[PDB]
Amino acid sequence: RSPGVFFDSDKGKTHSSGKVLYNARIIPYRGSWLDFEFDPKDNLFVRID
Amino acid sequence: HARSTGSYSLVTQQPLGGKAQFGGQRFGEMEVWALEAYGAAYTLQEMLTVKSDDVNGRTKMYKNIVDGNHQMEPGMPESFNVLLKEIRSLGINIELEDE
Amino acid sequence: ARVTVQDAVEKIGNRFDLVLVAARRARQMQVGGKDPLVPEENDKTTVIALREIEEGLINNQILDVRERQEQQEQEAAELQAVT
Amino acid sequence: EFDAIKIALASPDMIRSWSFGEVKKPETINYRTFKPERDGLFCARIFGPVKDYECLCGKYKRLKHRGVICEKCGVEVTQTKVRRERMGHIELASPTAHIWFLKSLPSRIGLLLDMPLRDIERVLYFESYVVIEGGMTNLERQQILTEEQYLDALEEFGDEFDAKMGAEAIQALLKSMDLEQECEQLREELNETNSETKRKKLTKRIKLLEAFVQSGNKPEWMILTVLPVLPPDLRPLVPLDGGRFATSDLNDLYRRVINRNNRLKRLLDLAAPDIIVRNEKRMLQEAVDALLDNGRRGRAITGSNKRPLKSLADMIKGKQGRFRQNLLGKRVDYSGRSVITVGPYLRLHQCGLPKKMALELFKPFIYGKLELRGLATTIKAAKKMVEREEAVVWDILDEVIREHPVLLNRAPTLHRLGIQAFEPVLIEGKAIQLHPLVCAAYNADFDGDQMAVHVPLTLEAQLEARALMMSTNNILSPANGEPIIVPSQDVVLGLYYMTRDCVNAKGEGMVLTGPKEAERLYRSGLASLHARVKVRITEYEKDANGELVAKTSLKDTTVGRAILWMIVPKGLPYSIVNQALGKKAISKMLNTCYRILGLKPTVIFADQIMYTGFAYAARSGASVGIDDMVIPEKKHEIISEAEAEVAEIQEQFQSGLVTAGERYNKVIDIWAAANDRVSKAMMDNLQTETVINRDGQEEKQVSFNSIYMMADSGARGSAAQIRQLAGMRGLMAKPDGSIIETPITANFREGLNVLQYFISTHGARKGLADTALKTANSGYLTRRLVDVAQDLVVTEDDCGTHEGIMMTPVIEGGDVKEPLRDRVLGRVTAEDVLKPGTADILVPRNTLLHEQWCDLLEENSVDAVKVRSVVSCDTDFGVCAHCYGRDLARGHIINKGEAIGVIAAQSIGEPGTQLTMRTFHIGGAASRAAAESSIQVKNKGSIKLSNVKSVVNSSGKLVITSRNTELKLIDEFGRTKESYKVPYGAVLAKGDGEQVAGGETVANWDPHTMPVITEVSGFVRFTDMIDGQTITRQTDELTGLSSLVVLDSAERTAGGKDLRPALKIVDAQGNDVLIPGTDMPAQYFLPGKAIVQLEDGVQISSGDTLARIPQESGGTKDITGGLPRVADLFEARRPKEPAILAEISGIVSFGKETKGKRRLVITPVDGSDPYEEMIPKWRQLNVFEGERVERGDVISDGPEAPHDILRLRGVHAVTRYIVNEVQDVYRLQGVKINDKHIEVIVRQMLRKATIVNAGSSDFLEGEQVEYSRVKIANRELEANGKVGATYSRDLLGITKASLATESFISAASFQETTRVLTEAAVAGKRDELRGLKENVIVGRLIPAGTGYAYHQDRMRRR
RNA sequence: UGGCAUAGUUGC
DNA sequence: TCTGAATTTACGGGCGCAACTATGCCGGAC
DNA sequence: GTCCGGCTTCGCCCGTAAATTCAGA
Ligand SMILES: [Mg+2]
Ligand SMILES: [Zn+2]
Ligand SMILES: [Zn+2]
């Protein structure tokens, strides 16, 4: 996967309600992964590595 | 490839695997199911006791074949003893209680 | 030689007791002491035993009767030689 | 020797008893001298001598010193075998918690102390304190103190007070518990409680405490103080290339546990500061946890190369562990492998074994023969003679191979015919010659396949091979009754060519004096193999009492048919060879020969069929060219019409009339229709392609085209592949079962340009991925099926049960698939089958329904027969022969002993895997139907409807408002001739009980949309709806009207989550129009993504579609997508929207209607009135306030949970449901499985039962026990004056049923070895090894086949 | 003289 | 302010069989 | 050459236990 920023969905397989979450991953060539994820309550959370 | 008798593995006294080393074919789990589907109980018993990992059993069976008698003493597989010891290496006391 | 054991199976209608009966009869002919009851045709003991079963002159009852007779004869011979 | 295996916790005293010496030093080998260390992991005085009967230092080196112990070093001079079984021990510096019982999920320690897992984890690894003996302080027992809390307690409660930390604290807590007292308080609290979740927790705690009390275990033994050490030979150091030894895994773990233990001991010797010793204790705990089960706690420690070390748990569990790698399947001597070739000359009972493998496998037998004949006195001489391959040892090999069968096995032994015994024939080569007929059984083509030869050694094994596993005994497949040695592709082609006719050939019309004359004419070249003639045929009919009666007549036949008739045995009729003799015809021929004549005639007939088919296929010179794939002239116009259709549908879509999903579905359906039309036109132009005449007018005939001649004969290929060759090859499917709407317009004879050869690769990738990635699902399913059903073995001959299941012909909605002939064949009847006329006993009660009885049923036209089923058997620990029925491998009843559980599991699992790996045989073309949209009745007869609640619309057309409407075409004799499924919202041309004639439609609908048809008239109100979050409305400004779509749970807003859009029919005044004679409004709820084309307050009439929901697409319907349904069925998965059923019968009444969760109540006539059900108000209800209901009746619609069916409708209902549901999937794929296997699997599923009343027995209140145990206990109780305990049967998934077994060995070898072993150890379980898997593992005779008699004798001689 | 890992490949 | 049921979330187990060839197998102080 | 030691995330599915959220009293 090319380094950069990529937005994916995890299209409804979680929460058993069909809601399509959204995640944004910043993949560096050499470094730590940074992900911005949503949840069913539509609150933006972040996780490092 | 073909093997009648060859070197056996160390941890479990079973035939070695492959043909680079003079190994035996694997009688897999599905093969055991297939033999169970038949009435082949003696064939299966000799397949997994006397032909694989019963050191006394296989030595005696070889000597009997050379002597011209086709009969086997079943015995107990060595891999079962290995399993027993491995379970005993935990805090689990598994034993074969008397008759 | 032998192709199918169907008639032998009909003679011992279980398909599993046939195996045990034939194994006993072949073992009695391989160690063996005993001799075949059917004209041997360059067959191995298993095939000869199965053919004996096919002819109707071997089964569990016959083998048990013969074993008991042999045991009684051996006991009688031992007793006579001793007392 | 032994008859049971006992498992229990290992007390420190027991561990010390096992060990022969403490291990103290973390060194294995000196690495300069290869001798073991003094008292290290590899030791001699602790574990025994390195060499047999030799001391370490060489003081004693002979058997004469067998037993004495050298004083210089202290090594007991004995064999090295003891070193393989001598255990050691390590005295841990501090107590250590056993990880298995800490993180078993559930955690034994956690819920024995009634403490959550997080807190006990915190305490164990030295991060918090736990109070012991709080006494008269401000502290409780299990309460937790951090460093701050501990400091506060110490400074404020310096008096008598104990708050330890680490595994010592947990051990103190465990030792300070009175198990029986705790049982008393927990039980009396359980009786005095009211909650349900707390009830479950309390009963789980009570169960664990009672398990501890009953067994000899103690709680504190769960914390290790003495650590056992495996014998060295089971963790060997084997030299690697060079001086470096093998980098063993157990040795590293054991050697970094001794390190921490020694370090901690040294620190405690000098009284190191509390923090350092605390950290050392934590490290010791982590090291021990890694040794026992690495990675379970987290941070799986990795050695060199960063690979996690294989711990003891990792060695005994998993696919690479002992159970599934060295005990259930082992490598075997006297076995070889080689590529396979054809060797057509072989008979069915023999296989070509190469001379080299024959010599290598039978070496001991050759040695025995050499010694017997005196050619080699000493075994060294015989070995030397054999290795030189002298001219005399070959004669020995021929003499010893005569009557010695060899097992031939192909790698994926999916079913029992994958391993079969053959008589060896010595071959000059390096490949095994395998008979052509058995290939179908093996699935063994000759394109590089390899097979393995095994040699039975003992007389019993040889006789088992000769009498059970010979290829001449396996004529019939064990899964069904059909033959398995049917000739595959060349023989069937030869027979099809031989038995065929053309209007004008050489030697036509002449009268022959017999088949011999026909062969003479054909060989002499005076008559063609296929030329109509008259032949004097003498056929034998044995309708007498076993006497063959000749019958001579003049048959109108062909030369080839007459020639083939010379091969048929006597008793068969002549019409059996008077047809074209395709593959199915030949299969039926062999089957009839087997049923009428026997086994040996069938074997000889099959061999002769193979020989003659090969010979005449060679003679025919049937080849394939490029001019044989003739392209139809109607292909282009069909393509153009389909393209016009897709263009117009796209034009409609761009106008908004249709949405994307339904447009895609319509495009797919029209392309499928076009593809079917092209295939039909191709076959029409291909079959009648040849018109031949030289004696008058033209006469059409079935073509001799090679492609058609091979497709029609069934030799190779089917409609799909020939279609792709000549006709358009149609739609493709992506790996995820998604159909590419773009078709492929070109066949294979034409180009397939770059773009078309890019869509194809999607389907090709799908086919190859399903072969290599989705085969694990079929293998997993079949392993689960085998491991749930392996101990089930036929024991008795008849249990004398009058229970059974009602087998009827199956018509799923089309024509008859499996007639009553094939559903009751070879199964014993339950009740007398009365004649359909008037109460005449047609068959007795306990007669096996073989072919003649089934034909009698057919000619008497019986519609339903009650037969004895495996699931309804009254036998304990097995199945009697009668309830099972015909063997299906032989023509007789099942023999007493044969293992039917393994056979059933293999039969159900093999076709799934085989079809999964064969999916790539059609490229990737999608298998599609026309999507119906109508019901065309074919035969005259009355029309009846079941499960129907319809309404008449404005146009007088009856509209179905029910979900499960069944439209049955009944005949004038009352027999249901056809069945059809009428979807919810179909328009019926005719009505109920109305006569119809063939070829006229009676129902039509729109398959791509589900409408929401009403029940009454009125105006439309968008009730309980808000724009923006409840629906998305689209405005049509130019027209002035508007549309709207309900947005599903995914799209709607979390704020105001529960807003339910509904269409409420109201009268002009504005009030709901109640449905006829009820008490609830006529409001229809709109599900997600529902297209409403109406406007608020618009007039409507009865039977009108308010809204239409797009039905969503269904991808390729192959095995790969249907197998998951079978897995869910056998796992007993609760559906996502289960249909709610009525627990009890009686009158119905709605109660409070509390909160949008409407309450239902069923009041029986005189029984328990106050029964109530919680039904959400958002789902429909079939029954309302007025009517009777029987238990198990549907209150709402939708999928039915099998658990509900079992609880309400009974065992027969659930087993019938499972059988029908799985058989639908397996019929869709053309898989033929007898229902016996599914029925026995269902039995194994429902093998447990929960007690509801203890009765007079000794069972608990709500415990789950084996149904057999409770049944026999009740039988014994009713034998006396007591009364048995009432029970309730449970349905368990195959995985849960297999895991929840009385024997812990079978479950341990199955999944979850860690959990199963932990539960068995805690409960102190005892295994009687009475199943098949346990006896395989232990290494004794199986209690299924020939070993059944041995096991019965042992039980009698217990 | 037997073990593990990685890579490649064959038959399903 | 408490308490039970149902729902959601976290986390552990499962993920076919058999076979053949090759290379590489520990990094840091005396 | 001979002797001694403790930085990777990224899959799909399902069963079961723990934590939360309703839904009340
Ligand atoms: Mg192949
Ligand atoms: Zn010594
Ligand atoms: Zn029965």
Curated annotation (Swiss-Prot), chain B:
Please give the superkingdom of this protein's source: Bacteria
Segment of the intact protein contained: 1244 to 1342 of 1342
Q: Summarize the subunit comment.
A: The RNAP catalytic core consists of 2 alpha, 1 beta, 1 beta' and 1 omega subunit. When a sigma factor is associated with the core the holoenzyme is formed, which can initiate transcription.
The name this protein carries in UniProt is DNA-directed RNA polymerase subunit beta
Q: Which family does it belong to?
A: Belongs to the RNA polymerase beta chain family.
Report the source organism: Escherichia coli O157:H7
What functional role does this protein have? DNA-dependent RNA polymerase catalyzes the transcription of DNA into RNA using the four ribonucleoside triphosphates as substrates.
UniProtKB/Swiss-Prot annotation, chain C:
List the record's Gene Ontology CC terms alphabetically: DNA-directed RNA polymerase complex
Which GO-annotated molecular functions does the record name? DNA binding; DNA-directed RNA polymerase activity
What reaction gets catalysed by this protein?
A: RNA(n) + a ribonucleoside 5'-triphosphate = RNA(n+1) + diphosphate
Would you say which domain of life the source belongs to?
Bacteria
Q: Does the keyword Transcription apply?
A: yes
Matches recorded under SUPFAM superfamilies: RPB6/omega subunit-like
Keywords (alphabetical) are: DNA-directed RNA polymerase, Nucleotidyltransferase, Transcription, Transferase
Gene Ontology annotations of biological process type: DNA-templated transcription
Database matches in InterPro entries = DNA-dir_RNA_pol_omega, Pol_omega/Rpo6/RPB6, RPB6/omega-like_sf
Q: Does the keyword Cell membrane apply?
A: no
> What EC identifiers does the entry list?
2.7.7.6
Xref: Pfam families: RNA_pol_Rpb6
Q: Which protein family is it in?
A: Belongs to the RNA polymerase subunit omega family.
Q: Which NCBIfam families match?
A: rpoZ
Q: How does it assemble?
A: The RNAP catalytic core consists of 2 alpha, 1 beta, 1 beta' and 1 omega subunit. When a sigma factor is associated with the core the holoenzyme is formed, which can initiate transcription.
So what does this one do? Promotes RNA polymerase assembly. Latches the N- and C-terminal regions of the beta' subunit thereby facilitating its interaction with the beta and alpha subunits.
* Name the UniProt record assigns to this protein: DNA-directed RNA polymerase subunit omega
Organism for this UniProt entry: Escherichia coli O157:H7
Name the gene behind this protein: rpoZ
